[PDB]
Structure formats: C-alpha cells, structure tokens
Design an enzyme around this catalytic site. Structure first.
Site, PDB file in Angstrom:
ATOM      1  N   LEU A 120       0.852  -1.190   0.000  1.00 25.21           N
ATOM      2  CA  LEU A 120       0.000   0.000   0.000  1.00 25.21           C
ATOM      3  C   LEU A 120       0.888   1.241   0.000  1.00 25.21           C
ATOM      4  O   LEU A 120       0.477   2.297  -0.470  1.00 25.21           O
ATOM      5  CB  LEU A 120      -0.933   0.037   1.221  1.00 25.21           C
ATOM      6  CG  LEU A 120      -1.913  -1.122   1.438  1.00 25.21           C
ATOM      7  CD1 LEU A 120      -2.508  -1.046   2.822  1.00 25.21           C
ATOM      8  CD2 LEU A 120      -3.013  -1.148   0.390  1.00 25.21           C
ATOM      9  N   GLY A 179      10.189  -0.026   6.179  1.00 26.14           N
ATOM     10  CA  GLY A 179       9.897  -1.091   5.235  1.00 26.14           C
ATOM     11  C   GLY A 179       8.627  -0.777   4.483  1.00 26.14           C
ATOM     12  O   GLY A 179       8.492   0.329   3.955  1.00 26.14           O
ATOM     13  N   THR A 180       7.670  -1.726   4.449  1.00 30.84           N
ATOM     14  CA  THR A 180       6.415  -1.541   3.717  1.00 30.84           C
ATOM     15  C   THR A 180       5.153  -1.659   4.593  1.00 30.84           C
ATOM     16  O   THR A 180       5.207  -2.179   5.708  1.00 30.84           O
ATOM     17  CB  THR A 180       6.315  -2.529   2.536  1.00 30.84           C
ATOM     18  OG1 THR A 180       6.039  -3.839   3.035  1.00 30.84           O
ATOM     19  CG2 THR A 180       7.559  -2.532   1.638  1.00 30.84           C
ATOM     20  N   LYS A 211       2.545  -3.090   9.150  1.00 31.63           N
ATOM     21  CA  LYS A 211       3.850  -2.495   8.909  1.00 31.63           C
ATOM     22  C   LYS A 211       4.877  -3.612   9.009  1.00 31.63           C
ATOM     23  O   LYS A 211       4.943  -4.309  10.027  1.00 31.63           O
ATOM     24  CB  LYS A 211       4.140  -1.372   9.898  1.00 31.63           C
ATOM     25  CG  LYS A 211       3.629  -0.046   9.396  1.00 31.63           C
ATOM     26  CD  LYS A 211       4.337   1.069  10.140  1.00 31.63           C
ATOM     27  CE  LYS A 211       3.610   2.376   9.989  1.00 31.63           C
ATOM     28  NZ  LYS A 211       4.068   3.341  11.015  1.00 31.63           N
ATOM     29  N   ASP A 248       5.619  13.611  14.858  1.00 30.53           N
ATOM     30  CA  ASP A 248       5.559  13.452  13.416  1.00 30.53           C
ATOM     31  C   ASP A 248       4.141  13.739  12.925  1.00 30.53           C
ATOM     32  O   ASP A 248       3.642  13.081  12.094  1.00 30.53           O
ATOM     33  CB  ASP A 248       6.039  12.065  13.022  1.00 30.53           C
ATOM     34  CG  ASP A 248       6.521  11.974  11.566  1.00 30.53           C
ATOM     35  OD1 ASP A 248       6.610  12.977  10.917  1.00 30.53           O
ATOM     36  OD2 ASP A 248       6.835  10.897  11.125  1.00 30.53           O
TER      37      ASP A 248
HETATM   38  N1  LIG Z   1      -3.502   1.705  10.151  1.00 31.00           N
HETATM   39  C1  LIG Z   1      -3.388   2.019   8.871  1.00 31.00           C
HETATM   40  O1  LIG Z   1      -4.275   1.796   8.043  1.00 31.00           O
HETATM   41  C2  LIG Z   1      -2.083   2.664   8.458  1.00 31.00           C
HETATM   42  N2  LIG Z   1      -1.222   3.003   9.448  1.00 31.00           N
HETATM   43  N3  LIG Z   1      -0.049   3.598   9.160  1.00 31.00           N
HETATM   44  C3  LIG Z   1       0.209   3.860   7.867  1.00 31.00           C
HETATM   45  N4  LIG Z   1       1.353   4.516   7.594  1.00 31.00           N
HETATM   46  C4  LIG Z   1       1.744   4.953   6.269  1.00 31.00           C
HETATM   47  C5  LIG Z   1       3.254   4.850   6.038  1.00 31.00           C
HETATM   48  C6  LIG Z   1       3.663   5.417   4.680  1.00 31.00           C
HETATM   49  C7  LIG Z   1       3.122   6.832   4.470  1.00 31.00           C
HETATM   50  C8  LIG Z   1       1.603   6.893   4.645  1.00 31.00           C
HETATM   51  C9  LIG Z   1       1.164   6.417   6.023  1.00 31.00           C
HETATM   52  N5  LIG Z   1       1.631   7.356   7.065  1.00 31.00           N
HETATM   53  N6  LIG Z   1      -0.590   3.562   6.819  1.00 31.00           N
HETATM   54  C10 LIG Z   1      -1.750   2.940   7.097  1.00 31.00           C
HETATM   55  N7  LIG Z   1      -2.615   2.612   6.084  1.00 31.00           N
HETATM   56  C11 LIG Z   1      -2.605   2.870   4.704  1.00 31.00           C
HETATM   57  C12 LIG Z   1      -3.789   2.583   4.031  1.00 31.00           C
HETATM   58  C13 LIG Z   1      -3.900   2.858   2.678  1.00 31.00           C
HETATM   59  C14 LIG Z   1      -2.849   3.438   1.988  1.00 31.00           C
HETATM   60  C15 LIG Z   1      -1.650   3.725   2.651  1.00 31.00           C
HETATM   61  N8  LIG Z   1      -0.612   4.408   1.950  1.00 31.00           N
HETATM   62  N9  LIG Z   1       0.652   4.499   2.365  1.00 31.00           N
HETATM   63  C16 LIG Z   1       1.300   5.181   1.430  1.00 31.00           C
HETATM   64  C17 LIG Z   1       0.340   5.491   0.384  1.00 31.00           C
HETATM   65  N10 LIG Z   1      -0.824   4.976   0.757  1.00 31.00           N
HETATM   66  C18 LIG Z   1      -1.536   3.437   4.015  1.00 31.00           C
END
Ligand SMILES: NC(=O)c1nnc(N[C@@H]2CCCC[C@@H]2N)nc1Nc1cccc(-n2nccn2)c1
Length: 272
Positions: free
Chosen positions: A15, A21-22, A40, A129
């Site tokens: 995502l 990482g991812t 994560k 952050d």
């Molecule tokens: N609990 C969650 O659902 C969730 N928690 N933390 C993050 N962190 C990301 C890390 C990377 C930067 C974005 C965000 N702080 N993401 C999440 N869910 C998500 C859902 C759909 C798309 C994306 N997504 N990530 C990147 C682009 N789309 C992320």
C-alpha cells in the site's frame, strides 16, 4: 500483544512504504469475525526492530476513537506491527485525489485530529511526526492519527522530551524550540498541527513549497508565515497562525485548539 502468524493472511501488493519497510493489507482471524488489518513490515536487510517495538509499546497504551488501534505484533519472515485498517489511506493523498471535499468536511476531519491530539496531550505522549501523511481515513468523515515511530512517553517530572541526536527530522512540521533546543512537548505538536491544517486546506500540497529546511527556519525567525490557502475560512487561518506562535509559553495547548475547532465546526454545521 503477540499474534499468531497462522491467523494472519497478507496480500502481496504494498500500500506504501517508509524507511522502516512496507505497509501491506491483510486479514486477521479474531475471536469470531475476520478483521481487515494494515501491517507495517520491516525491511531488516537492530535499530529498526527496536524502533518498531517502541512504536508498538506506545500504541498499546493508547485508547481513543481518533487514534489508530494496534491489534498486536508478530515475529515471522520479518517483525510486523498489525493495526486496524484505515481503508481510505493518508489524508494528504486523499485530498490531492478528491479536490472537491468541502470546507465543512475538512473542518470535521481536522477537528477529529484535534480530539485525538487533546487525548494524546492529556496522556502525556508527544507525537513528533504530526503531518497530513500521518492522518489516516477510515471514511471520508472519520480520521485517525497513526505513525507513532517518533513518539515519546513523557517522564513523570517533565513536560518535554529532549532529543539527544537530530535526524532525519521532518523539519517543515517542527516548532522553533525543536530545531533550536531539541525540546519536544505537546505545544510543539500544536505547531505541527498548524502545518497539518495548512496541508488539509491546501488539499494535500507540501508546506513551504520550494524551500530548504534552513530557509524555513530563517523565514519563521523573521516572523513570516505561510499565506491563507485558497477558500480557507478566515477563522481557520487565524487558528493556524495561533498554532504557529513562536514562543512556546504563549502557544495554545490542544485543549484550547480542540475547543476553537469544535465551536467553529458547530457554527458551520448551523449555517449549512
Ligand atoms: N492503520 C493504517 O491503516 C495505516 N497506518 N499507518 C500507515 N502509515 C503509512 C506509512 C507510509 C506513508 C503513509 C502512512 N503514514 N498507513 C496505514 N494505512 C494505509 C492505508 C492505505 C494506503 C496507505 N498508503 N501508504 C502510502 C500510500 N498509501 C496506508
């Protein structure tokens, strides 16, 4: 909370990603229902592992409707931090793709973030952050705060966290006392919240466009601030400027910020 790898089903498609990482989508078999989760997963090609466990340790202590809930952790192919899924993703990306979200709807979401932050401040945790990329949408009308990798539990005897080292930092979201004295309080998260509001009303545009971190510090020191985004209500720009108070002592806390947003949101709800 240690999870069972046999009860987790990860989707191959990523995502997103960070230095850690991812982020992948998955499903976790709960007591009865199956829960969609965001996972994560560490790159790990021991700092990243320690940082993921410290993040897990912070999220475990938090319980608020406007804060992403941690399900638990799992040690398999790599270390994994399993959270409830916020399907619509990061707020900055969402607003860049949905440029017709109303001003009323943006106020509703930023007020939800102020509620989550008022709770974090009451809990004596500093986010460190706080930015639109770290506000995740469950629905178009339900935001939650995530990304606690830089978060710190404050000591019982101090109102701030003193960082030892400095980098890599999201300088554009940081208050002058963070840059100048390495001091991080709920008041410095208020400064970040002002930048987040600017991002939200600018439909996910990067703040301080075209400027280096050092030029941003120079700009703020001269008392200059980013302009009012197009279509942003004057009351919301006024709140951004209040968040951006140079002197930490005079800067409002999240109790004052959430109250201002709450009252303005009810005024708007009335006019509509
Ligand atoms: N609990 C969650 O659902 C969730 N928690 N933390 C993050 N962190 C990301 C890390 C990377 C930067 C974005 C965000 N702080 N993401 C999440 N869910 C998500 C859902 C759909 C798309 C994306 N997504 N990530 C990147 C682009 N789309 C992320």
């Amino acid at each position: 909370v240690y999870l069972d790898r046999k009860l987790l089903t990860l989707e191959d498609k990523e995502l997103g990603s960070g230095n850690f990482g991812t982020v992948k989508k998955g499903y976790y078999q709960m007591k009865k229902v199956v829960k969609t989760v965001a996972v994560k997963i560490l790159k790990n090609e021991p700092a990243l592992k320690d940082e993921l466990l410290a993040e897990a340790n912070v999220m475990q202590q938090l319980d608020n409707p406007y804060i992403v809930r941690m399900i638990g952790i799992c040690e398999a192919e790599s270390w994994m931090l399993v959270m409830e899924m916020a399907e619509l993703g990061p707020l900055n990306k969402y607003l860049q793709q949905n440029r017709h979200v109303t001003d009323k709807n943006i106020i509703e979401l930023v007020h939800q973030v102020s509620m989550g932050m008022k709770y974090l401040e009451e809990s004596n945790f500093v986010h460190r952050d706080l930015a639109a990329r770290n506000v995740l949408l469950v629905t178009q009308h339900y935001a939650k705060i995530s990304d606690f990798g830089l978060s710190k539990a404050l000591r019982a005897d101090e109102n701030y966290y003193k960082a030892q080292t400095h980098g890599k930092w999201p300088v554009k979201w940081y208050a002058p006392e963070c840059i100048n004295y390495y001091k991080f309080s709920s008041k410095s998260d208020v400064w970040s919240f002002g930048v987040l509001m600017w991002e939200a009303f600018s439909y996910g545009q990067k703040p301080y466009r075209g400027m280096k971190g050092s030029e941003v510090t120079a700009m703020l020191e001269k008392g200059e601030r980013m302009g009012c985004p197009a279509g942003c209500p004057r009351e919301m720009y006024d709140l951004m400027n209040l968040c951006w108070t140079y002197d930490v002592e005079n800067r409002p806390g999240f109790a004052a910020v959430e109250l201002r947003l709450r009252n303005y949101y009810y005024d708007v709800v009335n006019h509509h």
